[PDB]
């Protein structure tokens, strides 16, 4: 029939949208994700420790904890995408702590 | 059909640049490219894709210069990392991070001119609203259709009854 | 006892953030920097929320204080008014 | 050495010239090469996302390792996302931007299979049942919904159904789109096996040979049911013979129609997804022949563009007049029937006849098997011998002008 | 009347908080101002096109504010613009006679006195007085002409999210987040009225507590000066509570004249259109909220919805809903009354367009106000 053969092993920084012609209507961010994606107990313990460091005799809320969550993933994914674009602009694929610092400097927080 | 067969057998504008293109390769350390191409060349044809293209683009490798990793990249492509998870037991009795304990602490620390049965009813209503929201987290994506009611007035009598009842539901309640 | 939760944030959480954030390759020591950045952001947000709660003559920090603190920081929160 | 070097240079030239010619390229390196590859009709388009998910069925080829039939998920850009204004680069002057968002290919389910997977085709009205050929005599039937997704630690395979009727291996397997449970298989044993699994008991495992054909005097290379007729099928065999059989015939040795195909052996065939009288066959004489069912004596057309034997020929589910064919020349050729008998200048004629429309040469070795995407247009998944699976799509300005 | 949801880049998809129109200019052309989180105050141009659609055209950009701006109201004359940012300072701009800016808007006045976010700003009947509210738990009154702080009210206990001036000029309405509504005199400069709890005789607090999921509690006097409308009201008919907007008359500010229930979504803003109208022919009953020789139209912006009420009828004549995903922020009326600018915190606004004569015949002469 057909001859066979042996296989081988195989091993600009702020992008503000111009006042006109920007018709983006991304619906997803318009609603909460309900995707915690981070374990609740260590975040809760960390927030408790920060609150204790600030002062005492205070309590938080479960809805407040979820709001802290949502803000955390939002800010962190924004920073990660910023570092990604910085790395592509820097002709690299692996993110480095210097990229984190440069992205934070772009955001102005640093 | 079968019978007949048997019988017979026997910035610029997007619209000016065209659709965007994707070019992803496994062997290339260069990242996947997602962009639109609009260069017009008469030598790069489907008949002879291997024809040389002078004055269009140099025939040199770019993945090596674009990405020479040689670093501990941790190998996060796939096959490891997503499934890994950790679980434990937390303590929430001292600094109560719970809705009932939160409302209890708010009432104890801060005292206002509110009746105790009123506070209990408010707490129960808040708990019911939280439970309703928790049940409603399953809606996920939901597009919105605009709802508009025209300028209906009591002078006109031929207007739609359904809109009249909907706005009647929003009537005015006077107080003596 | 209650002073050793700095490493509480799990590496799987960091790599899931990386996956959702669109980055494909991660270095072997960026975890500490990511945890520090998250801790700094959390400290700033909690400090602003506590300032708002104190000036609200209240004790328990609610979601409204958190959202107001985020607005002070410069970021908006969706799904929480 | 020299052949490897020239192949690498040709591949580099193709890599440089791909942006001008292609619109959607997804090159992936499989764990092991696949002798077959076919898409599934089901498509996933989750809400709130800008990408789509498709399913592929492939095999593996290992000399001394457990072969796994693989069902994989491929991520493709959304149709709406194809027109988005992201950024602008002053150097290239295009709305490019490398970024990081793109599709990716994941292996979902792996099922142990005794020996190499010669050919794997799903049965059209239920993707659950998948039929595979073996180097042994039997033909295996799996169901990924009735089998653990990850391969079991036990080395021996656990097929859902084992079918007997052949005496050694083969390379042609086909399903019947109009009747449930009908399967056609070919093997070197000079016989074609027709089986019906619709009457198989729930706990039954072994399936007997319903019908055996022995008209051919040589290796029955391929068989396939008609896409419209319910009892007519075709076969091509290395005796250079094309054979039209009707299951309603009372004789399994006397054919309904027997024709000589070419001066060289033939490999495969494929019928139109829309038409019902035109059939395409590939031979070893560097020709692909179209035959009309009205008259089988004279060839409808003899396309000639390859330099050696041509192995796999498939039609386009989206367009009636588009054919695709691959051989050992490492080129997948896309051919149009709307340019038949059209005058051309020699400058467009040195490369080949106007019958051809497109050539794909991004495969280092022989194209093992290719398949069209039944949902997206012009998307073709082709698997070659060096475990290279390319999900390619040519430019929108070459077929639409 | 038709609703157009704007798919235009208002504030580069950052939340939009407050808008106002040019009351001074009576022409068809309208100059709109919008405030957002991106520390930019954007002035746009809006006018009906040939098909009557409400389209917005960029006019000017403002970027002096270091932090987010939350409230923006124009003066009755319209020549001076108020901007309240998150840096505890309020700016007063004026027109001056630039690649993306068609005209320039220079800083004229810079008034301080706060320490935290400023949430509401209202002008007087003549524009010489300034009323504002901030997170600092004080209602603040300024002299616009002199540009100096003149009055501080610190009797509030929680956030104050809305202040307004009496067009007659004898009252100032403020509402803290502590479920308390206060009315202040001008000459007395003290708490003239303080209503928080209503008895029906069990008594209950009538406004929402800190737990509501809306930023602002904007309330405004009717330009006539005889109607006080307060959103974010709670009515306890039985064991439950329902969202409503309270309406008060000048006779008694303690007991509300009526309430308009809006169950489900929570009311947050009220704005009364500055154009008057004649009496629509209706049966002589108690349906009308108030009985006056001339009627007028106002709107209530709830957590999600917008309800357009008139003076002579009970139920709202206009109803807009399901147009923005996330909570509303503010509403504003045009000088001619043909435009309704509705802004939510999601990132884009909407325009409700009224054709001529649809809302009634404006008065040939506008009745005077007994100052």
Curated annotation (Swiss-Prot), chain B:
Residues 105-141 are annotated as: Necessary for homodimerization and competence for chromatin assembly. Residues 62-102 are annotated as: Disordered. It is found in: Nucleus. Contains one Pro-Xaa-Val-Xaa-Leu (PxVxL) motif, which is required for interaction with chromoshadow domains. This motif requires additional residues -7, -6, +4 and +5 of the central Val which contact the chromoshadow domain. Belongs to the CHAF1A family. Acts as a component of the histone chaperone complex chromatin assembly factor 1 (CAF-1), which assembles histone octamers onto DNA during replication and repair. CAF-1 performs the first step of the nucleosome assembly process, bringing newly synthesized histones H3 and H4 to replicating DNA; histones H2A/H2B can bind to this chromatin precursor subsequent to DNA replication to complete the histone octamer. It may play a role in heterochromatin maintenance in proliferating cells by bringing newly synthesized cbx proteins to heterochromatic DNA replication foci. Homodimer. Part of the CAF-1 complex that contains RBBP4, CHAF1B and CHAF1A. CHAF1A binds directly to CHAF1B. Only minor amounts of RBBP4 are complexed with CHAF1A and CHAF1B in G1 phase. Interacts with PCNA; the interaction is direct. Interacts (via the PxVxL motif) with CBX5; the interaction is direct. Interacts with MBD1. Interacts with histones H3.1, H3.2 and H3.1t. This is Chromatin assembly factor 1 subunit A.
Curated annotation (Swiss-Prot), chain C:
The modification N6-(2-hydroxyisobutyryl)lysine is found at residues 11, 24, 39, 57, 59, 71. Its main location: nucleus. There is a cross-link at residue 11 (Glycyl lysine isopeptide (Lys-Gly) (interchain with G-Cter in UFM1)). Acetylated as part of spermatogenesis progression prior to histone-to-protamine exchange. Demethylation is performed by JMJD6. One of its GO terms (cellular component) is protein-containing complex. Changing residue 55 to R: In TEBIVANED4; results in severe early developmental defects when expressed in zebrafish embryos. Changing residue 20 to L: In TEBIVANED4; results in early developmental defects when expressed in zebrafish embryos. There is a cross-link at residues 11, 39, 59, 71 (Glycyl lysine isopeptide (Lys-Gly) (interchain with G-Cter in SUMO2)). The modification N6-butyryllysine is found at residues 11, 24, 57, 59, 71. The modification Phosphotyrosine is found at residues 31, 68. Changing residue 15 to W: In TEBIVANED3; results in early developmental defects when expressed in zebrafish embryos. Changing residue 71 to E: In TEBIVANED2; results in severe early developmental defects when expressed in zebrafish embryos. There is a cross-link at residue 71 (Glycyl lysine isopeptide (Lys-Gly) (interchain with G-Cter in ubiquitin)). The modification N6-lactoyllysine is found at residues 11, 57, 71. The keyword Acetylation applies. The modification N6-(beta-hydroxybutyryl)lysine is found at residues 11, 57, 71. The modification Phosphothreonine is found at residue 60. The nucleosome is a histone octamer containing two molecules each of H2A, H2B, H3 and H4 assembled in one H3-H4 heterotetramer and two H2A-H2B heterodimers. The octamer wraps approximately 147 bp of DNA. Found in a co-chaperone complex with DNJC9, MCM2 and histone H3.3-H4 dimers. Within the complex, interacts with DNJC9 (via C-terminus); the interaction is direct. Interacts with NASP; NASP is a histone chaperone that stabilizes and maintains a soluble pool of Histone H3-H4 dimers. This is Histone H4. It comes from Homo sapiens (Human).
Swiss-Prot record, chain D:
GO terms for biological process: brain development; chromatin remodeling; DNA repair; DNA replication; DNA replication-dependent chromatin assembly; negative regulation of cell migration; negative regulation of cell population proliferation; negative regulation of DNA-templated transcription. The modification N6-acetyllysine is found at residue 150. GO terms for molecular function: histone binding; histone deacetylase binding; RNA polymerase II cis-regulatory region sequence-specific DNA binding. It is found in: Nucleus; Chromosome, Telomere. There is a cross-link at residue 150 (Glycyl lysine isopeptide (Lys-Gly) (interchain with G-Cter in SUMO2)). Changing residue 118 to A: Loss of interaction with ZNF827 and loss of localization to telomeres. Changing residue 116 to A: Loss of interaction with ZNF827 and loss of localization to telomeres. Its main location: nucleus. Keywords: Acetylation, Cell cycle, Chaperone, Chromatin regulator, Chromosome, DNA damage, DNA repair, DNA replication, Isopeptide bond, Nucleus, Phosphoprotein, Repeat, Repressor, Telomere, Transcription, Transcription regulation, Ubl conjugation, WD repeat. InterPro entries: G-protein_beta_WD-40_rep, Histone-bd_RBBP4-like_N, WD40/YVTN_repeat-like_dom_sf, WD40_repeat_CS, WD40_repeat_dom_sf, WD40_rpt, WD_repeat_RBAP46/RBAP48/MSI1. The keyword Ribonucleoprotein does not apply. The keyword Repressor applies. Changing residue 25 to A: Loss of interaction with ARMC12. SMART domains: WD40. GO terms for cellular component: ATPase complex; CAF-1 complex; chromatin; chromosome, telomeric region; cytosol; ESC/E(Z) complex; histone deacetylase complex; nucleoplasm. Belongs to the WD repeat RBAP46/RBAP48/MSI1 family. This is Histone-binding protein RBBP4.
From Swiss-Prot, chain E:
One of its GO terms (molecular function) is histone binding. The chain holds residues 1 to 392 of 559 of the full protein. Keywords: Acetylation, Cell cycle, Chaperone, Chromatin regulator, Cytoplasm, DNA damage, DNA repair, DNA replication, Nucleus, Phosphoprotein, Repeat, WD repeat. GO terms for biological process: DNA repair; DNA replication; DNA replication-dependent chromatin assembly; nucleosome assembly. This is Chromatin assembly factor 1 subunit B. Differentially phosphorylated during cell cycle. During mitosis the p60 subunit of inactive CAF-1 is hyperphosphorylated and displaced into the cytosol. Progressivly dephosphorylated from G1 to S and G2 phase. Phosphorylated p60 is recruited to chromatin undergoing DNA repair after UV irradiation in G1, S or G2 phases. WD repeats lie at residues 11-54, 64-97, 113-152, 155-194, 207-258, 278-319, 323-364. It comes from the Eukaryota. It is found in: Nucleus; Cytoplasm. GO terms for cellular component: CAF-1 complex; chromatin; cytoplasm; nucleoplasm; nucleus; protein-containing complex. Subunit of the CAF-1 complex that contains RBBP4, CHAF1B and CHAF1A. CHAF1A binds directly to CHAF1B. Only minor amounts of RBBP4 are complexed with CHAF1A and CHAF1B in G1 phase. In G2 and S phase also monomeric CHAF1B is detected. Interacts with histones H3.1, H3.2 and H3.1t. Belongs to the WD repeat HIR1 family.
